[PDB]
Amino acid sequence: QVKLQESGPAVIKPSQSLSLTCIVSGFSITRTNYCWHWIRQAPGKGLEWMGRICYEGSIYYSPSIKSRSTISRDTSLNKFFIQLISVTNEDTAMYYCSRENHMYETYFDVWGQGTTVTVSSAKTTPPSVYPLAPGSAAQTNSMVTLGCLVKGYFPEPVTVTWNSGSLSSGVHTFPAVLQSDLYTLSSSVTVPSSPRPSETVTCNVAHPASSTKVDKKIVPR
Amino acid sequence: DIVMTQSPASLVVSLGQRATISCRASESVDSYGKSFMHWYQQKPGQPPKVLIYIASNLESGVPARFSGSGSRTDFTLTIDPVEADDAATYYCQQNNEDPPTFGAGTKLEMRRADAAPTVSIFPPSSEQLTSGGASVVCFLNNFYPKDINVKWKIDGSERQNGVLNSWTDQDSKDSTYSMSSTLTLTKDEYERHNSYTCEATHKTSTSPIVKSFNR
């Protein structure tokens, strides 16, 4: 039924134009009453409203963005956009588009996933995936933890799954942390000690800003 | 325009209990005799989810235990009994006049019985060593509460620095936390020492949980 997908650049040099695109899908920009909004949330902060463009073209901007912003749509493609001129680090945030029934309801009922945007002069560098296999220890109760080390990539984010989504339980995936403009991340899966080594366990990491996708099977040591 | 003031900024409530978040608006958010302010919930790395709209009305799916109250300038979300899943930030928003505005968020973290950490230590993968680097990794999984201290003792010596720490957010099924430490060494550095160890010290056991290996 409705889908919204934000797309934009992972990274952008300071003092350049951020331009995002929100792609409504399976519902039209112009059905009456809906207004289409942009909301951004700077990391570890609150949602902040940026502006809306209502189904029939009325636009409205948060003062703060007003004079460095331009919200336009494209009625034929069924997508809308926003341009943020002369970005700085305070533009680094997660950007969301959502939908509002402005006549009967007043609230944001559909929201896209949100892309992330990092304003930085750094280079997007792809990730090294290293398997974490228990250094030499079987008969370790009935469970084994194994993990993946995803070291040195930039900008955020990374997806990492285990056995392509099939291992859903036991997984932990820890926030990326910085090592002077480079990220390291890690994920673990605990599994009963019979499917590892016997069955295959693989972490799958994808780091879309560089279109790196690597699978890594955790073999014993 | 209206400034939306949520309070408390954060709070810890135990399972089965009641939490009361409140959101105050600098001016009335009322028109057509309805209060046009709504509450949202945002589990980490999830878009906000509507919970309650137009001050009292519950959105489909949101369980019984969410109660939207108040009017004009005074509004109260009440979750009782709190459970697992509600470990999240809650925002209230007005959308009665331009620009619409959000509260600052209230983080609900919530209380369970103190669990102790399953720690796991993993040596370098050969791949990294090949590339001249060496990261030793210790997973201190599934505990409550979050305050936990890790000590990286290589051959008797706490290697003070060269270490990285990340903690999950609270789990939305068992309410725990988990964290990972990455001690990162030069190949050779690692190549000149037979033991490495992480010592988790934490409320549940007075005795630091030690785990180690031969280089």
Binding site: Y60, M103, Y104 | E97
Partner: peptide, 10 residues
């Protein structure tokens, strides 16, 4: 002019 519809009042 406040409330729903506010935006496309005109």
């Amino acid at each position: 002019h406040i409330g729903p519809g506010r935006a496309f009042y005109t």
